[PDB]
Amino acid sequence: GDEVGALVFDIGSYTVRAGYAGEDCPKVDFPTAIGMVVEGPTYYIDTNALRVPRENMEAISPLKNGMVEDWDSFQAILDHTYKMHVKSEASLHPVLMSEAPWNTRAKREKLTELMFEHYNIPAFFLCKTAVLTAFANGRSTGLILDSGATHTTAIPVHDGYVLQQGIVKSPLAGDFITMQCRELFQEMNIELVPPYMIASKEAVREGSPANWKRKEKLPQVTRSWHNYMCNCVIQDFQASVLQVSDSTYDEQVAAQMPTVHYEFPNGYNCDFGAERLKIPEGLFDPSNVKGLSGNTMLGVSHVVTTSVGMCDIDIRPGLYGSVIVAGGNTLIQSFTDRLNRELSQKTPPSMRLKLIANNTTVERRFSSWIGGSILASLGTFQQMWISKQEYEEGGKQCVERKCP
Amino acid sequence: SDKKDAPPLLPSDTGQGYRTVKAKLGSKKVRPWKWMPFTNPARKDGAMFFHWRRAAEEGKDYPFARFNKTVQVPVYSEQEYQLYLHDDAWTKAETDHLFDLSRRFDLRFVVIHDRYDHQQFKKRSVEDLKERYYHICAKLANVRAFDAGHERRRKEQLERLYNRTPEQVAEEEYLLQEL
Amino acid sequence: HQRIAELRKAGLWSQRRLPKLQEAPRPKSHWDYLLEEMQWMATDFAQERRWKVAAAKKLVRTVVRHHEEKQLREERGKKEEQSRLRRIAASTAR
Amino acid sequence: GLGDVRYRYCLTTLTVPQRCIGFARRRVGRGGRVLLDRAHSDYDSVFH
């Protein structure tokens, strides 16, 4: 027996994962975005209230790359989480929140202040998302490549503690690919019908412009909300169509390999050939891309090499024996093997280099939350939580005295 | 973890069909479990949490307290630094900060240096902290009564060997084995 | 020969050995134990997920088997009843 | 081999399902239940 009534919250750049300690998978996974309406945050929360079109409702994100951008919207996200998805008043359940290693210490302090003062939870703890991702795989010596929508980062962890200065940050992330497919849409002129108006499916054969109708009842929607929903559509496109070349992108090979088919919400459908292989090469080599191609842009293999190099050789061999890839962008088809070859070239194979296997959507996205679930139920860890009576001074002094 | 193999094998009683074990189960009953508040003796602050236990062990003690061992730290406030724990390059503030941080990170030197504050104090390498910790421990031992340089040579030898450009890696490693 | 000289000069400070191994010991502590308990619990998590996926697969496929065998049994029963009546007719005509 | 110290799978034979399961090692999960892990060894076919 090592378990307590612990809830593990893992708020990344795209979705918030809330679940109980010991659970194999997060209980709920609903997006970071949240709705707004005129009077404070008159509201709409998850994938069910954030999608129905509404009279001039606008959608924002209280998060940005993992750092909190609006603590009131964050508080209301948490309130709805507790109210419905976990449907347990928070006054009893110990909680541990995951924060990106590069998130500010002052923001950690303010997060603790909000948590304890308002929600009056009886215990608390903090542990970084990369730390938790390496926590899931059971490996002390690990190197993590986290890549969500808004940011891609590489972080090593040894003895379970991040090399706090050994952080590499690269905007070449899910949003990078999403912008690339956006400019693809524009260049070959996809008209992105949002699914929420379509009411007919007069589909058409390949390439033809499909016919359809828009529902008369629809009210006006702020541009931000429409932008968010079409962004989700193109995210589905990212998941479905994008594929990554095993080796450096080549035009003749990219044309030779069989094309693939994607259909859009309104019935418009199109086939993609070399462009889908070309696009992730932009992540693996920013130079070929439009605009976002300056030498300042750093690709995945260069990112891992930089993160590995900045730390000395007393732990670099440990990083060699395990490369761990997490986050969304690692799910682009054949991304992991491409990264593996890329590092095998960049990093001298002269010494023992291994990857660590993890594939499915549960294992990449929620590996940050799975590590938190592993910690929360850990027997020795039960002593570490910041108690309320401790919090009285801990939220200021021991939120750092305790949680490195 | 695994390498994509057959699923684990778990203990079970109702293999066969609960027609075999009907008697072995019907003749006995369960020890009443309860959700009970406990406080670990390993906690410096007497906070209390819940967990499932048998209601006959209630509040007994936390078996994981025996994992709460900690490693010692030297002590000095006003005069022991000058008399015994002498230093001519490190201030009392820097020594105390490094010591508190080493306790933070439990003398794990690599992440200790990783944290070592580079803007409250002047920069230095891991082995400097390691050797200074050895020196302070030696001084404490005397009052209360292998080689760092070769480790630097280590770091540099590994750095040279690995930074070696790939073609030279291949050629030298050929030269390495031939003789 | 040329290899010998190249290695000799390089071996002075740059090849053939990592010079000495440090010998300082380290007592065991609380964080290392927590990390080992970690490793054990992560192994437990992964293996439990594997067992549950395999068990759900086996159970759902046994249920599908139950349904298919049931449908085949009903079809076979109808066919057998038809053939039994046909054989009774044959016995009387015979 | 590389001599990893933790992956000590071994041939084992159960009693009730009396057969050589192959490479399997014993572990204690949550709640004090002793579980046998397994490998899908390329020797799998040899155990007929």
Binding site: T141, D314, G318 | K69 | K28, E37, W40, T43 | C10, R26
Partner: peptide
């Protein structure tokens, strides 16, 4: 043979007394 009890992989046992040990983080000492 391996003439062992195919030992357990239990949760880390609680220490009766210290046993000063730690693996080489590099996993490459020789």
């Amino acid at each position: 043979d391996q003439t062992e009890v195919m030992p357990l992989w239990t949760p880390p046992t609680p220490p009766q007394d210290d046993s000063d040990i730690y693996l080489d983080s590099v996993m490459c000492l020789m």
